[PDB]
Amino acid sequence: ICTNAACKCANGCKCGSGCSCTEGNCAC
Ligand SMILES: [Cd+2]
Ligand SMILES: [Cd+2]
Ligand SMILES: [Cd+2]
């Protein structure tokens, strides 16, 4: 799954094949 630990989503985000954040830049 989204390996980007910089992501702070909750059970619901489709961060499976559409990540768009960097290391210290999460704007989901
Ligand atoms: Cd994110
Ligand atoms: Cd997400
Ligand atoms: Cd992500």
| Residue 23 CA to ligand 2 centre (angstroms) | 13
Cα 6 to Cα 12, 13: the distances in Å are 16, 14
Alpha-carbon span 12 to 18, nearest angstrom:
13
| Residue 28 CA to ligand 3 centre (angstroms) | 8
Buried b (16+ CB within 10 A) or exposed e, 7-22: beeeeeeebeeebebe
> Which residues neighbour ligand 1 (ion) by CB within 5 Å?
7, 21, 26, 28
1, 16 contact by CB (below 8 A):
yes
- Residue 24 has a CB neighbour count (10 Å cut-off) of 6
DSSP string, 11-26: TT--TTS----BTTB-
Question: Tokens in use for 8?
Answer: 């702070």
19, 2 contact by CB (below 8 A):
yes
Question: What method did the depositors use to determine the structure?
Answer: NMR
Helical ranges in the chain per DSSP H: none
